[PDB]
Design an enzyme around this catalytic site. Structure first.
Site, PDB file in Angstrom:
ATOM      1  CG  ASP A 195      -0.281   0.087   2.519  1.00 28.82           C
ATOM      2  OD1 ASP A 195       0.786  -0.534   2.684  1.00 28.82           O
ATOM      3  OD2 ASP A 195      -0.803   0.792   3.407  1.00 28.82           O
TER       4      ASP A 195
HETATM    5  C1  LIG Z   1       7.763  13.699  15.917  1.00 32.53           C
HETATM    6  C2  LIG Z   1       6.495  14.553  15.926  1.00 32.53           C
HETATM    7  C3  LIG Z   1       5.448  14.185  14.851  1.00 32.53           C
HETATM    8  C4  LIG Z   1       4.017  13.932  15.395  1.00 32.53           C
HETATM    9  C5  LIG Z   1       2.866  14.669  14.655  1.00 32.53           C
HETATM   10  C6  LIG Z   1       1.490  13.932  14.606  1.00 32.53           C
HETATM   11  C7  LIG Z   1       1.357  12.785  13.552  1.00 32.53           C
HETATM   12  C8  LIG Z   1      -0.095  12.348  13.176  1.00 32.53           C
HETATM   13  C9  LIG Z   1      -0.823  11.392  14.181  1.00 32.53           C
HETATM   14  C10 LIG Z   1      -2.076  10.651  13.612  1.00 32.53           C
HETATM   15  C11 LIG Z   1      -2.390  10.886  12.106  1.00 32.53           C
HETATM   16  C12 LIG Z   1      -3.717  10.299  11.612  1.00 32.53           C
HETATM   17  O1  LIG Z   1      -4.340   9.519  12.282  1.00 32.53           O
HETATM   18  S1  LIG Z   1      -4.358  10.809   9.949  1.00 32.53           S
HETATM   19  C13 LIG Z   1      -6.006  10.031   9.491  1.00 32.53           C
HETATM   20  C14 LIG Z   1      -5.864   8.917   8.421  1.00 32.53           C
HETATM   21  N1  LIG Z   1      -7.124   8.452   7.811  1.00 32.53           N
HETATM   22  C15 LIG Z   1      -7.404   8.527   6.445  1.00 32.53           C
HETATM   23  O2  LIG Z   1      -6.550   9.005   5.704  1.00 32.53           O
HETATM   24  C16 LIG Z   1      -8.739   8.017   5.909  1.00 32.53           C
HETATM   25  C17 LIG Z   1      -8.793   7.674   4.398  1.00 32.53           C
HETATM   26  N2  LIG Z   1      -7.648   6.873   3.937  1.00 32.53           N
HETATM   27  C18 LIG Z   1      -7.069   7.061   2.665  1.00 32.53           C
HETATM   28  O3  LIG Z   1      -7.583   7.928   1.970  1.00 32.53           O
HETATM   29  C19 LIG Z   1      -5.861   6.214   2.165  1.00 32.53           C
HETATM   30  O4  LIG Z   1      -6.223   4.917   2.488  1.00 32.53           O
HETATM   31  C20 LIG Z   1      -4.486   6.534   2.826  1.00 32.53           C
HETATM   32  C21 LIG Z   1      -4.573   6.446   4.343  1.00 32.53           C
HETATM   33  C22 LIG Z   1      -4.087   7.935   2.398  1.00 32.53           C
HETATM   34  C23 LIG Z   1      -3.356   5.500   2.319  1.00 32.53           C
HETATM   35  O5  LIG Z   1      -3.371   5.424   0.993  1.00 32.53           O
HETATM   36  P1  LIG Z   1      -2.476   4.108   0.067  1.00 32.53           P
HETATM   37  O6  LIG Z   1      -2.775   2.899   0.922  1.00 32.53           O
HETATM   38  O7  LIG Z   1      -3.198   4.202  -1.250  1.00 32.53           O
HETATM   39  O8  LIG Z   1      -1.035   4.575   0.079  1.00 32.53           O
END
Ligand SMILES: CCCCCCCCCCCC(=O)SCCNC(=O)CCNC(=O)[C@H](O)C(C)(C)COP(=O)(O)O
Ligand SMILES: CCCCCCCCCCCCCCCCCC(=O)OC[C@H](COP(=O)([O-])OCC(O)COP(=O)([O-])OC[C@@H](COC(=O)CCCCCCCCCCCCCCCCC)OC(=O)CCCCCCCCCCCCCCCCC)OC(=O)CCCCCCCCCCCCCCCCC
Ligand SMILES: CCCCCCCCCCCCCCCCCC(=O)OC[C@H](COP(=O)([O-])OCC(O)COP(=O)([O-])OC[C@@H](COC(=O)CCCCCCCCCCCCCCCCC)OC(=O)CCCCCCCCCCCCCCCCC)OC(=O)CCCCCCCCCCCCCCCCC
Ligand SMILES: CCCCCCCCCCCCCCCCC[C@@H](O)O[C@H](CO[C@H](O)CCCCCCCCCCCCCCC)COP(=O)(O)OCC[N+](C)(C)C
Ligand SMILES: CCCCCCCCCCCCCCCCC[C@@H](O)O[C@H](CO[C@H](O)CCCCCCCCCCCCCCC)COP(=O)(O)OCC[N+](C)(C)C
Ligand SMILES: CCCCCCCC/C=C\CCCCCCCC(=O)O[C@H](COC(=O)CCCCCCC/C=C/CCCCCCCC)COP(=O)(O)OCCN
Lengths: 104, 69, 178, 88, 459, 56
Positions: free
Chosen positions: D43
């Site tokens: 992925d």
């Molecule tokens: C060191 C200090 C840094 C800390 C900063 C904070 C970091 C962030 C913490 C938490 C972040 C989250 O939860 S962010 C929320 C994440 N949720 C989603 O994105 C929902 C929909 N998903 C999609 O559109 C795709 O599946 C995708 C995921 C893009 C993959 O794509 P591929 O599979 O096609 O590559």
């Protein structure tokens, strides 16, 4: 005509290096260019700068600084050889000055 | 392994430097040699009192031969 | 740097870029490799927690909250590669890059040295001059009437055609030109 | 002097080395042209991690706009070769 | 003094009788010879001036200016012949004639014994400069620039004429020796105040004083290269020379009549140095730097101390040479790219290394690096101002900082960074340009060994 | 052989001749200001047995 006037187009500037790869940037004619460079270099760097700087450096001491130093040496020697002050606060003799007789 | 180095043309600046140095030296080496020869063989004058009844010339109040000339 | 940009970034692209930035800043915070690996797997797990979300609104809100968390907890002095736009060697060798058109102004005595190189340069110049008109014609053909929509350029499609606008891409000076 | 000039064979060998040190990829299965999404069943996050591993391997950063399209080892090798002016 | 004037006049038939392809060579050679001859006036007596005759005299103030003019003429000829190559023979001869007439008027102006002759020649300098600017200027704003340059000067100069004839009527003479020996104090009256203003404002506007300086950017930017050279190097110094000559009879009024001019000069040197920090045109920056340096010269003249006059003379000479060099450096790039915008051509050090060295040396002399004569004059003026008042050091230091700032800003913008990609017509530097820069810079450094030649009569 | 080069290079004498003429006129101008020659209280002097003037 959709035009305002009969004008020659603006020409492109021509590179002196194109017809003369060593052209010195003085003239289009290579001989005139070379002689222009030669006369400029000779009459500027050879004649004016070096010879003129030598002439200015060896200018005679018309400003009377060595003379002033020698005169000062003589005056100082004469004055401290007799215990006289080295300089007076009065530049001119008070005996030839006629102040107004009354101040009140 | 050896590769070509793309550089601006250095012929003209080097030529200008050689020409300027050439003319400056052409005119200034004889002057330096002449000054050295004059200083070595015809030194500076030495201070002397004005003799009785004698009036010096205007150039005789300076001590360096080149300045006197 | 090499790819034509798009009009906008998708939610997926923003999510991946935030993931990469968070990983890099966590590596900056976690100097040692084992601790960095541990916390990077933890970050990956927390990131995959919302992998299969279908509501775009809540996904966008999660992205915004994650960006706020990253900004509050970012490293004030993150590690930067030396040649990167913030690195200590970013534009160090830019003063050594001389454009190729300067070679035409060389004195003939300078070109007396290096004869084969200049013969091959003459070959390259003939190639460019003989390909330019076909490049222009192809660009005119493959372009919509209302001008280009993106910064993408088409490849060559004929037998002896070269991709349009190739001279200044092929003739880059170098990355270490001296 | 400095490090010897880089070559295409060395780039490809190092890329395959890094990919064979990845756990989610079969060493036998992996190939230079092996697609990441299609053939290896990966992925986008795994691709991001692979790009970061390549940056750590070669000591230079790849911009996100360009890293998005490196979906096979050959593309990574080509990108690295073209960026560092490696022609043989 | 005729041994200088007559060859300068002979330059005219010599260039009018030359072949179409020999005018530049002949004019340059004989101008250099005339400069060599004029170099002999530096032998000064100390106590008094060299009084050749009733009409002309030479001073320790006049001699460096005369040598600077005679030396500037060949540099002007060298700079002009590149952009005038397409001109007809008659028009090139007319241009050289304008230059020769300007030189003649300048050399006669600096040696006149009497103030009406000085005024006549000092006004006569206007016509050749106006013709040069309005005929051989490149842009369409040269007409407006010439109108500004003419009328700003004349509006100040006419009251000077009235004051001079009134002074000659009241005193009986305007000969500078009689003026100095028979000097009497100016009382505190409105008539004397307006006489002071009429004697001062013409030289004020020629410097130029801040607030009366608007003509200078127009005229210096819109003129051809030789016109800018002569405007910055020599024509700005006419005001300072006139002030030094005329303030002899203005005491003791100058004690308080100089306050607004000192305030204007200090704050305006700050203002023009700041202006140089945000300039999109390369020539305007040099013009405004000239304005700042002349403001410092105005302060030096106004405070009326021997150290101030010495510093003012040194600063005039150094500024003339440095400004001429900077204008030539800008003109080379303009001839390359046909635009005056500073950020158009960048990273020129990669393409032109020796010209970059010339740029660096000119920028270093502009910021008055020790032990150059620029800092000699500036330091003498600053010390004299400190004696005048200890609070002047704040403004002097601020001006020094801003001067270094914009000088290095210009150097970095024009020479450093990466080259502009699309500009591909930058040819290697010609021998003429490098020789012109060398002939500008070498006398500057050589004058450091003998600073007393340019320190003036108060030395 | 010299006719044509003279005809094309005679312009190179105008400035030196002007210089010589200027020096000559400077001497003539000096000749008109001899009212106080050997008459100043600082430089008044007794003439040498063979000299006619103190300066010319
Ligand atoms: C060191 C200090 C840094 C800390 C900063 C904070 C970091 C962030 C913490 C938490 C972040 C989250 O939860 S962010 C929320 C994440 N949720 C989603 O994105 C929902 C929909 N998903 C999609 O559109 C795709 O599946 C995708 C995921 C893009 C993959 O794509 P591929 O599979 O096609 O590559
Ligand atoms: C270049 C191209 C690129 C661009 C160029 C850009 C430049 C453009 C320039 C443009 C032109 C400029 C023109 C300027 C003209 C200047 C002329 C002038 O004014 O001359 C003045 C001056 C002449 O003085 P003067 O007024 O004639 O003196 C008369 C005296 O009354 C009496 O004097 P004297 O009786 O002592 O006589 C001494 C005599 C004889 O002295 C001796 O021989 C004795 C020396 C000691 C020898 C002892 C050892 C040898 C003998 C023993 C060994 C053999 C026997 C034993 C064997 C034993 C074996 C075991 O020789 C001399 O007089 C000295 C030499 C003079 C040379 C002057 C040259 C000037 C040239 C002008 C033009 C230059 C153009 C450029 C090109 C120049 C040419 C290359 O010359 C000098 O100033 C020389 C300077 C010496 C400096 C000494 C060291 C000082 C260091 C202090 C600083 C310390 C910190 C470090 C600083 C380092 C700085 C370098
Ligand atoms: C202090 C050291 C003493 C050394 C003794 C010998 C010095 C002889 C030098 C004669 C004057 C230089 C002429 C300037 C025009 C540029 C020439 C050129 O185009 O290069 C072609 C030539 C050929 O090279 P290339 O491979 O073909 O390519 C060159 C590229 O274009 C690019 O090449 P580039 O990037 O290397 O640039 C060329 C070079 C040349 O560019 C320059 O800027 C050099 C000029 C210095 C700055 C000028 C304005 C600042 C005000 C100082 C005024 C001092 C006047 C003193 C009298 C001078 C007599 C003419 O630029 C620099 O090296 C960096 C400039 C930083 C200079 C900082 C000095 C501050 C004051 C130091 C003390 C000054 C007073 C001395 C006494 C103090 C108390 C004991 O390159 C050179 O030969 C380099 C020149 C040597 C550097 C001289 C730096 C210090 C000398 C200052 C005056 C000498 C005073 C002597 C009295 C005794 C001490
Ligand atoms: C590019 C390659 C660069 C590297 C090569 C560099 C080579 C070495 C460079 C360093 C040289 C240092 C020289 C140091 C000076 C030594 C000579 C110096 O001492 O002489 C000076 C001489 O300097 C000159 O006097 C002053 C220079 C005059 C300049 C006139 C220039 C000609 C006019 C040009 C036009 C000017 C227009 C503007 C004028 C207002 C000072 O003289 P002074 O100590 O007292 O004399 C004592 C003995 N005397 C009095 C009997 C002579
Ligand atoms: C943009 C730059 C342009 C150039 C700038 C030129 C600057 C010119 C300013 C001249 C400096 C001062 C002028 C005269 C000195 C004192 C002026 C006056 O204000 O002082 C008092 C004068 O008292 C009153 O103020 C009278 C003057 C009032 C009328 C003048 C109008 C001023 C308004 C400002 C107008 C702007 C002028 C510039 C236009 C461009 C002193 O009191 P007093 O001791 O009793 O009088 C002394 C004179 N005595 C001896 C003959 C008796
Ligand atoms: C381009 C900008 C430059 C502007 C400079 C203009 C300022 C010039 C200075 C004033 C000009 C007029 C001066 C007059 C000439 C002086 C001669 C003189 O001293 O005579 C006075 C005469 O004084 C006057 O008449 C002066 C009156 C002013 C007439 C014109 C006024 C115009 C505006 C004046 C103020 C502006 C001047 C400075 C402004 C500078 C530029 C902003 C006294 O003579 P008597 O009558 O015999 O008196 C003694 C016996 N009873």
């Amino acid at each position: 005509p959709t035009i305002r006037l009969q004008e020659d187009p603006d020409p492109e500037d021509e590179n002196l290096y194109e017809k003369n790869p060593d052209s010195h940037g003085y003239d289009k004619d290579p001989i005139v260019d070379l002689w222009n460079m030669r006369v400029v270099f000779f009459f500027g760097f050879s004649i004016v700068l070096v010879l003129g700087s030598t002439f200015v450096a060896y200018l005679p001491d018309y400003r009377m600084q060595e003379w002033a130093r020698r005169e000062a040496e003589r005056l100082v020697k004469y004055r401290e050889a007799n215990g006289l002050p080295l300089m007076e606060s009065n530049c001119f003799d008070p005996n030839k000055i006629q102040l107004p007789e009354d101040e009140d | 392994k050896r590769l070509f180095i793309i550089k601006p043309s250095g012929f003209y600046d080097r030529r200008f430097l050689k020409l300027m140095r050439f003319y400056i030296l052409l005119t200034g080496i004889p002057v330096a040699i002449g000054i050295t020869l004059v200083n070595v063989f015809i030194g500076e004058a030495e201070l002397a009192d004005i003799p009785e009844g004698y009036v010096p010339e205007h150039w005789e109040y300076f001590k360096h031969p080149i300045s006197r000339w | 740097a090499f790819s034509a940009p798009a009009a906008y970034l998708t939610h997926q692209q923003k999510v991946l870029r935030l993931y990469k930035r968070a990983l890099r800043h966590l590596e900056s915070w976690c100097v040692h490799r084992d601790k960095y690996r541990y916390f990077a797997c933890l970050m990956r797990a927390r990131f995959d927690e919302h992998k299969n979300e279908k509501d775009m609104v809540k996904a966008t809100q999660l992205l915004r909250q994650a960006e706020e968390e990253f900004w509050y907890g970012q490293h004030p002095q993150p590690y930067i590669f030396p040649e990167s736009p913030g690195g200590t060697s970013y534009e160090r060798y830019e003063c050594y890059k001389v454009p190729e058109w300067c070679l035409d102004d060389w004195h003939p005595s300078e070109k007396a040295m290096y004869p084969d190189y200049f013969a091959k340069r003459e070959q390259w110049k003939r190639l460019r001059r003989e390909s330019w008109e076909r490049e222009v014609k192809q660009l005119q053909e493959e372009t919509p009437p209302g001008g280009p929509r993106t910064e993408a350029l088409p490849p060559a499609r004929k037998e002896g055609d070269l991709p349009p606008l190739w001279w200044h891409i092929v003739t880059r000076p170098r990355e270490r030109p001296m | 002097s400095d490090a010897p000039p880089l070559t295409l064979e060395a780039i490809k060998d190092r890329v395959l080395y890094v990919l064979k040190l990845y756990d989610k990829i079969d060493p036998e299965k992996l190939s230079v042209n092996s697609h990441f999404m299609k053939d290896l069943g990966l992925d986008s996050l795994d691709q991001v991690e692979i790009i970061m591993a390549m940056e750590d391997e070669f000591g230079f950063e790849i911009p996100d706009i360009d890293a998005e399209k490196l979906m096979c080892p050959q593309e990574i090798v080509d990108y690295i070769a073209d960026k560092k002016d490696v022609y043989e | 003094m005729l041994k200088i004037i007559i060859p300068t006049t002979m330059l005219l038939p010599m260039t009018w009788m030359s072949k179409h392809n020999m005018i530049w060579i002949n004019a340059t050679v004989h101008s250099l010879l005339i400069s060599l001859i004029s170099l002999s006036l530096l032998n000064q007596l100390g106590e008094n001036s060299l009084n050749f005759s009733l009409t002309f005299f030479s001073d320790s103030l006049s001699a460096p200016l005369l040598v600077l003019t005679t030396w500037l003429l060949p540099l002007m000829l060298m700079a002009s012949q590149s952009h005038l190559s397409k001109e007809t023979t008659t028009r090139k001869k007319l241009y050289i004639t304008m230059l020769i007439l300007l030189q003649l008027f300048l050399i006669m102006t600096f040696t006149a014994t009497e103030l009406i002759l000085f005024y006549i020649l000092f006004e006569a300098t206007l016509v050749p400069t106006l013709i040069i600017i309005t005929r051989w200027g490149n842009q369409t704003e040269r007409l407006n620039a010439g109108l500004y340059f003419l009328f700003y000067t004349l509006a100040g100069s006419l009251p000077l004429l009235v004051a001079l004839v009134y002074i000659q009527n009241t005193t009986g003479s305007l000969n500078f020796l009689i003026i100095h020996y028979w000097s009497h104090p100016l009382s505190n009256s409105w008539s004397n105040i307006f006489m002071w203003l009429a004697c001062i404002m013409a030289f004020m506007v020629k410097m130029p004083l801040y607030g009366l300086h608007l003509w200078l950017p127009k005229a210096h930017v819109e003129a051809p290269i030789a016109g800018s050279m002569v405007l910055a190097a020599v024509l700005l110094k006419l005001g300072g020379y006139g002030m030094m000559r005329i303030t002899t009879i203005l005491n003791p009024l100058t004690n308080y009549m100089a306050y607004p001019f000192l305030m204007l000069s200090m704050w305006g040197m700050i203002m023009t140095s700041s202006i140089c920090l945000r300039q999109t045109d390369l020539k305007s920056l040099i013009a405004y730097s000239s304005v700042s340096h002349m403001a410092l010269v105005i302060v030096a003249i106004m405070i009326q101390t021997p150290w101030s006059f010495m510093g003012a003379t040194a600063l005039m000479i150094a500024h003339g040479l440095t400004s001429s060099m900077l204008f030539c450096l800008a003109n080379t790039n303009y001839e390359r790219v046909h635009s005056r915008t500073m950020i158009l051509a960048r990273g020129l050090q990669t393409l032109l290394p020796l010209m970059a060295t010339w740029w660096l040396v000119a920028s270093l002399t502009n910021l008055a690096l020790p032990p150059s004569i620029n800092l000699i004059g500036e330091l003498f003026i600053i010390t004299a101002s400190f004696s005048w008042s200890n609070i002047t050091i704040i403004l002097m230091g601020m001006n020094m900082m801003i001067t270094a700032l914009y000088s290095l800003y210009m150097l970095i913008t024009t020479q450093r960074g990466k080259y502009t990609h699309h500009i591909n017509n930058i040819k290697p530097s010609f021998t003429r340009e490098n020789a012109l820069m060398a002939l500008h810079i070498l006398p500057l450094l050589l004058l450091t060994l003998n600073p007393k030649m340019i320190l003036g009569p108060l030395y | 052989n010299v006719l044509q080069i003279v005809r094309d290079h005679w312009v190179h004498i105008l400035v030196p001749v002007g210089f010589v003429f200027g020096c000559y006129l400077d001497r003539r101008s000096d000749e008109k200001l001899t009212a106080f020659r050997n008459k100043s209280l600082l430089f008044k002097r007794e003439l040498r047995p063979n000299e006619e003037v103190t300066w010319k």
